[PDB]
Structure formats: structure tokens, C-alpha cells
Subunit: 349 residues, 4 copies
Amino acid sequence: VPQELIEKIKLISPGTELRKALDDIINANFGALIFLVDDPKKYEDVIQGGFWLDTDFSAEKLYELSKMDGAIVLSEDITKIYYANVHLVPDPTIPTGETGTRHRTAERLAKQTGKVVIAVSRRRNIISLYYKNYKYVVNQVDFLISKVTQAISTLEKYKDNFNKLLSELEVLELENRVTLADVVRTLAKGFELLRIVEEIRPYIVELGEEGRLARMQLRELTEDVDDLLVLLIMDYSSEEVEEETAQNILQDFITRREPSPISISRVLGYDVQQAAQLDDVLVSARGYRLLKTVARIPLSIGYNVVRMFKTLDQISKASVEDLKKVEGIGEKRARAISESISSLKHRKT
Amino acid sequence: VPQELIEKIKLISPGTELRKALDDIINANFGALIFLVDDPKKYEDVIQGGFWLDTDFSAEKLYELSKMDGAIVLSEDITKIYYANVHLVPDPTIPTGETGTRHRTAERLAKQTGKVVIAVSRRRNIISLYYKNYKYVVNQVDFLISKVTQAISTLEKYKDNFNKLLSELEVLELENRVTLADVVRTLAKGFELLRIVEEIRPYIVELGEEGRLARMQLRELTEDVDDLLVLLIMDYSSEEVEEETAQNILQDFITRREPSPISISRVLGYDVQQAAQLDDVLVSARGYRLLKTVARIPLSIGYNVVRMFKTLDQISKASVEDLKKVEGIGEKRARAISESISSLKHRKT
Amino acid sequence: VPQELIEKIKLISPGTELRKALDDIINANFGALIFLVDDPKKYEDVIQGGFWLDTDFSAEKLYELSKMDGAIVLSEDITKIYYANVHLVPDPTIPTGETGTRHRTAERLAKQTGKVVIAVSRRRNIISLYYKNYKYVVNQVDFLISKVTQAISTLEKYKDNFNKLLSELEVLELENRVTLADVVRTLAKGFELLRIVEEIRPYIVELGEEGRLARMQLRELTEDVDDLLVLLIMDYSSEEVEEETAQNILQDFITRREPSPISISRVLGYDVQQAAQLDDVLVSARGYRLLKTVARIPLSIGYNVVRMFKTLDQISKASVEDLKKVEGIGEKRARAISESISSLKHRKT
Amino acid sequence: VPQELIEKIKLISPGTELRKALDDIINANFGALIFLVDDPKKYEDVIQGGFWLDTDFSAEKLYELSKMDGAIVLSEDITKIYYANVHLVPDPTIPTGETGTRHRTAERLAKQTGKVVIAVSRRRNIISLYYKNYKYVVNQVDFLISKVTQAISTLEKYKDNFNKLLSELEVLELENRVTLADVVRTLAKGFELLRIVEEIRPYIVELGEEGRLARMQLRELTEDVDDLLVLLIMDYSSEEVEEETAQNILQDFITRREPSPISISRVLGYDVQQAAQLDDVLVSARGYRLLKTVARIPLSIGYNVVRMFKTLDQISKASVEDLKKVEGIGEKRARAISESISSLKHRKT
Ligand SMILES: Nc1ncnc2c1ncn2[C@@H]1O[C@H](COP(=O)(O)CP(=O)(O)OP(=O)(O)O)[C@@H](O)[C@H]1O
Ligand SMILES: Nc1ncnc2c1ncn2[C@@H]1O[C@H](COP(=O)(O)CP(=O)(O)OP(=O)(O)O)[C@@H](O)[C@H]1O
Ligand SMILES: Nc1ncnc2c1ncn2[C@@H]1O[C@H](COP(=O)(O)CP(=O)(O)OP(=O)(O)O)[C@@H](O)[C@H]1O
Ligand SMILES: Nc1ncnc2c1ncn2[C@@H]1O[C@H](COP(=O)(O)CP(=O)(O)OP(=O)(O)O)[C@@H](O)[C@H]1O
């Protein structure tokens, strides 16, 4: 969904004066045919008849002008109403896949001029927007809120299961009993959770102002999940990896690649073939996840701690004095790490 | 609900071009009478008048043809529109339980020809589908989403209570203090939970594309519940039972048998008569549930471990060396079992 | 809301053939005036004109007969349609508080004859039922489901807070650090929770078949709450009390009395005046709640255990041998009590 | 939103007889123009024609009078209907921003007379209320319930995250490992949570009777949150602060100031500039939060305990005898504090 088109779609999104008028028009069962031009002078040949207005835009004006037949002509920035009641005459040899004169006209004209054309039928309560060769249908808020509410509910359940997986893995991590299965399983649920988010984003966008609460709900459900998955990947990849690499793996099981168990493990540097094999692969976390998240050690200095101790299991045994021997951590960070890890082990075991 | 009928119902399910047209037709308060034929030549005697079209199907075409009186005739695969505006003349001595000419015609014709006949009244917003001797009413998405959302909410609350029961039983299992009451109670809630799922499945099906999120929500709520109940049954049945047997018991308190306390215990091999008696019946888990779920030991090799130690209580005491004496578990699986059980006992006690 | 009236209301509740017809009638904006008689012969003087039918009832018939003006006459059991298109002529000197001829007629006739009269206006989508001197408005399912869904959500939040209170009190109970404030607070939330349930019950009833899922949701949210509050009251009342007494106290803060802190404590046998005073009142549970709920000791034998040890704190210290000295508990129940209490103390402390 | 206006808005809020009539009027697509006067004699010059009624108000009467053209005139207390079918003639030189004669009339008249004028269009289902120079649009319950339900869902997710933050901080507080980051983070989420509540309050108000359940849901979600944040602020401010001061800080990140990390810490008496700096700032709670909340020690006497021991870490080490040396706490309060803190440390560590 190209961003040029996305700019256009915000023109008719909930919260704009234009959408308020369109909403009223829909509610009244007037139709609508709106041509978004910037230099009205130049479209002289596709505009016939009607009334030259050159007046300031407003929702009420647009509404009232919609009671008349034919099309209305607006400035691209929706600040001026140029014409009402016009007959729009695009080239009829232009191919169109639309039904009925209103939408065939709108599609042809949008392709011929590269401008925006908005079309609303009298009966159907749907806003179709034609721009160049695109066509985007904009839904009513009723419909959007319902799909978004379903999705957020869906997200909740993924998040719960992700939290269960994660706290289970936490026990295993502190006890150095982690298998590749435990990691891959946790990652997969995280990946799926963020995917759902990706899938619903266009709806959130289509909701405009009306999607303020949904945006907040998403953010609460997912805020630290990206960072968390990136740290898991860093901690359990077969060979070490920079933040940026891991960050790109995350980026990908969310978009280009589907996250199957075998897929994730292979991408993690493990040569595996079958499901049942993952339970037999033992792995130890380098310790980045707890160092950043719990010990609040910058991932900057994290590497230093890892390169000295290699794994979280070692780090958990290090004395303050031992830990202090690392560069990037002094007296304060030493106690932060040992007390963090010591506290977690005594509480989750 | 026969599967032949089920195939037919997906023809008009959300996501098909046909349903999109039907939806628009409903919204416009046109009626509809649609005859799904494959060899139009052969129904010459039940089709009079109207227009021979033989044109490619589309939702917009079907919509427009619906503005006219009478019936429309489609190919069974919904790729061709054969007729519009026809008078359909089925045998009127065929018994019908329908009201008004449209639905009496549809029922009679569907029985006479064994084909599909779709009928939509102008006022009522409901799709009736007649096929042979069946009649299936298809609901609007509005109505389906509401019932499904209620059911998922219902499921949530069953799942919570099931989780509470289960984690309570977990304590009891690790401490070898389990009574038949604790088991039967846990099982019953699981059974009821899966039943609700069974009850709502037709609605999920009727939702078609529009039920993608509900499917995902169900799966998250229930994924490992079947396996879990099967393992409980295996662990607490009076005499030992194969996976397949237990799997069939589960299959049944979900469908053919209602899961009362006494019922479940009797089916579990315990000769009991009264409720209050179950609290006095002491039972010990063989250990399959934790061996598979937590120790990630294949149920294959599980039996071997059980047959040697008889119960989870024994298994929890076995040394690695002891455990290693079992066939099917080596050095890795030994530590997996003892560390698993050791970890759970120290955390839940 | 008298039960005679309640029987009548189920006549038009979701799931009945009558309601299905009424629903369709509402959707069509026909009006309706329905007179529920058993001996049509005897109402000769309040029924003029129209058509004598004496036909079997059905929803479709009732619908079709509703297209005509005037009233329809049914048998009380809704098995026969006696008249259609009649003019109903009740005594006009009977006082009525209704507007417009349809509802004035319905109210007067219902009072004059003590029978049921159903009235539906063409515009408004509401079912009014007159019977004797009663008038009950029945709402659409749309409206009911929304209020019930709000209430269940409300209930959820009360239940969560009740669970938090309760598990907090559990810690305090095991450590013998309970004050009257802790008890009263817990009880109050329980009382409020069950009250909400009481408040919504008429809506659940009005929902008929359509309220199956809401009934299940309520039951899951509240199943063991009554028993739990009754046990709290038994455990923390100033003087000992039978089950039945406590059961009646519960029954009352739900209905006749509003449950303020001071109120509940005074009803609990504590002479208190001010809020802040409750924190200073130390109390110890007799131990009924854990004996029944956790030790699965019948409240029958519970008393015996209490009368010997007086409090849960004592009971928690008793040896098996000590406990066995009680009548009603043998070897099995002794270990059940000591292991129960021992397990809880080690897990919640 | 001035309170004079707020009084007026409750006139047309769900639950009033007036709103019931307005609702019916909307449902019937009658328009409405209602003038709320107390001394009808004095508005002789802005009221022409129509019928002098001087009758008692009722919803049904108002409805019926709405079938006629023109305006209706009511007493300010909505107890009398004075006129119907009148032509209202306000000064037309009064500036108005409304469209169409009904709403231009209503705005002008409301400004000219300082009285209330209610206007309802035939098509649009919206109630506009003009009073003096104000204009308030009142929404349908449908619309309000949807926004409120979204907000409560939003609140839930903030509350969960706030609870997680808080219980995490609890561990840190008992172990004396708290940094300014931990405090500021917790506070911020609390602040944001109460803000959302502030944002939705007008909707709750607009819901009138129909917002009983939403009010209860809010109260359950937020009851002890204000007190909790006030105690955090008291416990972690750089210099000591009275209840009232802290209570005013809370009051402010909810309203006048946006709660950024740096903002909150600076307002907390810490001279910080950058985000990353907060993790390095070590802080110890004075102990007010646990003393009040858990030890149920009045904040009155709290200060005394603090001024002697300075921090929660000290207090946690004090003997009963030590603690008893404080004024305001005797034998009972000593054991309350040491047992409280002792219990929490053993359970959360
Ligand atoms: N080239 C054109 N220029 C200006 N206005 C046009 C136009 N083509 C159509 N319209 C306007 O759209 C009206 C008819 O378009 P239709 O395709 O029939 C939309 P509709 O009738 O509302 O859809 P419907 O099928 O859901 O009822 C015309 O009467 C006209 O006012
Ligand atoms: N044998 C038949 N063949 C073709 N079309 C038929 C038909 N019988 C009925 N129809 C179509 O259906 C129309 C009337 O059927 P009705 O039973 O009255 C449905 P309706 O009027 O929409 O239901 P309603 O009672 O909810 O208003 C006819 O006018 C016709 O166009
Ligand atoms: N005594 C009576 N006997 C039989 N039918 C009656 C009746 N009184 C009224 N009716 C039926 O009800 C119709 C008018 O009643 P109204 O009070 O106007 C209901 P309505 O018009 O649907 O309510 P509305 O104000 O919402 O529009 C009459 O035309 C008649 O068919
Ligand atoms: N000064 C005035 N005094 C009394 N009544 C007035 C009035 N001005 C308008 N009205 C009433 O309002 C009616 C027309 O007002 P409109 O602005 O057209 C509201 P509407 O038509 O319902 O809005 P709409 O644009 O959504 O359709 C008049 O016919 C009149 O009955």
C-alpha cells in the first residue's frame, strides 16, 4: 500500500472535515462524486456545466451541495470548493472494472488525470477513493472498531501465552536446562504476536482519530516485545550476532519469512531437519537479556561481560570482584548484576 | 449436519463473491431466488420464460439481475449466470413447510431436483438454503460475531477455572495427596471447555473469512488442552490404558456422554456410587503428564519409565543412575526427568 | 416482580414461537394487539367483529394476521389463534396511564379481565405486556446483551479484587495476623459481587434462550463464592454460629441490608462505632474455611475439630495423633488436615 | 466545561423524562426546537403564534407536540409545557456559526436570552444544546458506550502494566536496590492511567443513568491508585514532603504537566538532564507506602517512625523493642510493622 496513496487516504479519515461531510452524506443517502484538483483552470475539458463557486470549504457546504446531481470539485488541500453540479467527462476508452456510471466515471477520471476522485453510492455506505491507478475502499468506523476489537482480543491471548512461555523459559534459563525447542517455541509466539499487529495496522490507520484508544492498547500489549525477542535471538543464536543482525532477523519472521520451528532454528545457526530433534539440542544463553533488562547494563557494555564469561551460567557465579574485572562495569554495575541474578534465582527457584 | 450440506454452505459463506452479492441484495431489500444447476438444458421443464444469458458470473451482475422479478439460474460452481427473470415451476404436490410463494417454491424445487436453491425475502435479512431435503438458514455476520464473542468470553472463564484447578492439582500431585475428587473435578472442567468449543464450531464455520480471528482465539485458548486431559486420564485411570483408549474417553465426554462426577470416575475404572465418596478415594499419578509435558520424554519411552517405577512419586525419588536403568532413556533424559521433577517440587512447595 | 407475572413474561421470551413472530412483526413495523384468552366464548362482549378462525397457532400465521388492523385473540397456552382483526372494547372508565388508543385499550382490557394483553406499536420496537394490574416492558435482545455484557465485565473486576483480597487474607490467616478490617473488607467485596448478580438476574431471565452463555459466564465467575463467604462469617463471627445462621447473614447483605464496614462488623457480633477502629480489632479464624475447602472435611465433623482446638492456629500445630483424638476424623482425615495446612503455610510463607 | 453548562446537560441526560422524549423524537425523525424559559410572560417578543398550553410536562406529551411544526416552550425545571407550534424570532443580527434555520435560530435565541435551547434535526440523530454562548452536542448512548468500553479496555491494560511495574518495584524496595528509573517508570504509568480516567469522565457524565456500570468498573480499576502514587512520591522524593504536597504533585501530572521521565524526577527534587542518567541514581524508600498500606499505620504516626529510622531498610531491621521506642506506636503497632515487613521479605525473596 504505497505511501502516496496513504497520504490521500488520510484526507477522508475520521477526524477530517471532509470525512464528517462524507459521513453525513452517507447517512442521508445522497450520492457523491468528488474531484480533487489544484488548478481548476486546467481541467476545463473534463468539467462541463454546473456552477462556478470558488468558495471556502466546509463540511456543511459540501453536504448541501451534495443534494444536487453530478459532481463537486475541490482543491487538493480541501480548502476550496470550486464547482458543484458538474458533469465530469473522462475518456471513455480508458479501461475500467467498475459498475455503474458513477464509479466508472471516477476510475476513468482518476487514471486520466492522476488526481483523486471520491465516489459514494446512494445505497451502499462505502467510500471508494480512486487515485491514478489505485482504488482504495474506506470502511465505516462501526466496521473498523469491530475488527480491531476482535484483533486486540486475539492479541491478548497471544500475549498471555507468550508470557507463560517466557516465564517458563526464565526458570529453565536460570537453571541452565534450556533446549532449542524452548527457545524456538518462545520466539515463534512472539513472532506471531507482532505479525498480528502488522496485519491490523492498516485498520488502525483507517480509523484515524477514532483509533486513538486502539493505538494505546496495542502499545501496552507490545511495548517491550520487540526488544525482548531481539535479546532472545542474541542469547541463543548458535554463533554470536550484533544487535543489528538480530534486529533484522526479528524484522523478518514478522514480514518476509513464515516462522516455523525448523525455520527459526536454521536461521538461528542450527542445522536441524525435524521437529522432534529440537528437544535434544541443548543451549545456554549468553546473558544479554537479563543483563540489559534486569541488571540495566547497556548492551554496549553487555558484550564485554559476555566475552569474558561466555554465558549467563558463568555470570551468575561471578563474584563482584570477578565481575568488576570487566571493562565497562565498575562497582555499581557489579553489584547490579550479581544482585539481579542472585535475586531472580532465589525467587524463581 | 451432513458434509455434503456443509460444502454447499461454504458457497454462500463470507468471502465468496456470491455472498458479497447476496449481502448487497439484502441491503437493498431486493428479494432473491437462485437455482444452482449444472446442465441448464435438463431443467427445461422447471424453468419458464425470462432471459437466456449464458454469461460469466460476477457479484455486480447478480445484484443487477436481482432488481427484476422471478428467479436467477446459476451454474453449481457459480461461474456462469444462465437465466434471469425466470418463473420456476416445481411439482406443487411436493410437501412443503414453508410460508409464501418464494420459499415454498425453493423448498419444492430443491427436493424435486436435488439441487441447491437459495431464497432471500425482501424484508427479512436472512439467507435460506434448500438442498435436497435439507434447509439451512445462514445468519448475518453481525449476529454471528456477537454469539461467537460471547462464547469466547465464556470459554475464557472456563479456561481460567480450569487453570486454577490444574495448578491446584499440580501441588497435590507433587505431594502425593491426590483424591479422585481432585482428578474428576479437573477433568470435568476440561471436558466442559472442549464441549463449548464443539457447540460453537458451526458458527465459526458460518463466519467463513470473517472468522479468522475467532479461529485464532480458540486455538490459543485450547491448544494443549486435549493432550493434557488425555494425559490426566492416562495418569489416574484405575488400570493402565494406551494413549488411544484415553484419547477415546476424551473424545466421548466431549460428545456422546455427559461428564458427571460419578460418570467420569466409573469410566475411569472406579466403582463409585455417590458424590461424597470421591473425596475418600486416594490416587497416585503414574507420571505421564509431567514426563511428556515437562521432561519432554516421548510417550513412547514414557511407558518404560512408568512400568519400572509405577508412579510419579517413585520417579521423583529415583537417582539419575536409577532412572538410567530404564530403556529408552539415557544420560540426557535421566537428568531431564530428575531435574524437571526436582525443579517443580522446590518451586511449588 | 411477582412470579405469576414471571410465568407470563416467559411466553414472549427469546426462544418461543410467539417471540419469533413478535420479532418479525417489530421488524416489519406492523403494530400488534394480542389478547390471551382461554375460553373465547366468555369474552363475547369485549370482542367485536373480525374473523373467527379457531386455527392452530404458528409464528408465520400470527405474522400474516398482523398485517390487518385491530387485535388478534390467542389461547393462553399459545396453541390456538381464535380471532383476527377484532375490535377490543374494554370499559373506558377504567383508569389508564397509557398514551394512544392501542396501549390504553391493552391496559384497560388486561385490568378488566385479568388476562394477558400484548401491545406493540408500529414505530417503537418495544413489547409491552399488560396482565391484571401489571405492566412489563420487554426489551430487544440487542439491548439486553449489551447491558449483560457490561455487567459481566463489571463482575469480572469485582471478582479480581475479591480474589486479591482473599489471597491477601489467606497470608494473614496462616500467620494469625488478621484484624476485623481485613475480614470486613473481604466480606464487603463478596457481598457487592453477589448483589450485582442479583441486580442483573431479571435481564438474564428476559434474555431467555439467548442468555445461555451469560448464565454459564455468571456461574463460572461466582460458583463457590456463596460458600466461601458463609465460611468466612463462620470463621470470624464474634460468637460461634451454625451454617444456617451465617447462610442467612450472607443472604441479607445481598438483599435487605447494605453492607457498610460498621454494619458488617456489628452484624458479626462486634460492638464497633467508627471505621478506623476495625484495624485495631484482632481476630482468629476458627478454621472452618480451610477444613472444608482444603482439607475436604465435612462441616458436619468440622465443628468437632473446632470445639477441640478453638482456632486454626491451634489446628495448624496439632499432630496427626492429636488431630485423631477428635471424633469424626480418623487416620485419613488427620493427615488430610495436617498436610493441607502444612502445605499452605510452606507455600504462602 | 463550565459547571453551569454541566447542570444544563444533565437535563437531557439518559434517565430524565426529557431525554426519553428526545430519544423517541429522534427515533421518529421528527425534528425538535425547545426553548427553556421560566417566566413565559417575559419572552412575549421572541415567541409568536402557536398554542398556549400551560399543561403539566410528560414525555408522551412532548413527543406528540413534536409532530407539529415550529418550537415548543418549556419551564426551566421541565415541569410545564407552556407553548407548542410557536415561531421563535431572535435578533437575526446576532452572529451564528450554525447551518440551516433550526440551529441558527437556536444559537441566536440562546445567546439573546441566556436560556437553554435544544435543537434536534429530522435526519441527524444528534442533540445540540445551546445555552448563552455555549454549544454542547450530546451523543447517543450507542456511541458513548462504545467509546467508554474501549477506554475501560484501555485502562485494564494500563492497570496490568502498572501492577507488573509495582510488584517488580516491590522486590527492589525490599532488597534496597531501587533506582530513580524504577520509581519514575512506575509513577509515569500510574499518572497515565489516571489521565485516561480524566479524559473519559465527560463521557461517563454524558451517559447519565446508563453509565452506572462504567462508573463501578472505573472505581474497581482505580480505587487505591491515587493513594498509592501519593505514597510513592512521599517515599522517593529527594527531600521529605507532606501528604498535601505529594497529593498536589499527583494532581498535576494528571492535569497541568505531562509526565516525562526527566520531568517527574526533576519535580521529585532530582537534578537530572538525560534519560540514561536515571538508572544510575540510587534511592531508598522512607517506608510510608508499606507502613500505611501493609502495617496499617496511620500516616499521622508514620512520620514519627520515619524520622527515627529514616528508611524502610532500617525499619525492616528494627526489633519490636526498637520500634516501640517510637511515639505513636505501642506494642500492637510494633508487631504489626515488624511482622508485616518480615512477612513480605520472606514471601517476595
Ligand atoms: N460523469 C458523471 N458526472 C457527474 N455525475 C455523475 C456522473 N456519472 C454519474 N453521476 C452521478 O451518479 C448518479 C448515478 O450513479 P450510480 O452508478 O447509479 C450510483 P448509485 O445509484 O447511488 O449506486 P447504487 O447502484 O448503489 O444505487 C448520476 O445520477 C450522477 O448524479
Ligand atoms: N415460482 C416462483 N418463480 C420465480 N419467482 C418467484 C416464484 N415465487 C415467488 N417468486 C418471487 O418472490 C416474490 C414473492 O415471494 P414472497 O414469499 O412474497 C417473498 P417476500 O415478499 O420478500 O417476503 P416477505 O413476506 O418477508 O415480504 C415473487 O414476486 C417472485 O418475484
Ligand atoms: N380497541 C382497539 N381494538 C383493536 N385494535 C386497536 C384498538 N385500538 C387501537 N388498535 C389498533 O392500533 C392502532 C393505533 O394505535 P396507536 O396508539 O396509534 C399505536 P402506533 O401508531 O403504532 O404507535 P406510535 O405512536 O408509535 O405510532 C389502531 O389503528 C388499531 O389497528
Ligand atoms: N425560528 C423557527 N421557529 C420555530 N421553528 C423553526 C424555526 N426555524 C426552523 N424551525 C423548524 O425547523 C424546521 C427546518 O429546520 P432545518 O434546519 O431544515 C432542520 P432539518 O431539516 O431536520 O435538518 P436536516 O438538514 O438534517 O434535514 C422548520 O420547518 C421549523 O419547523
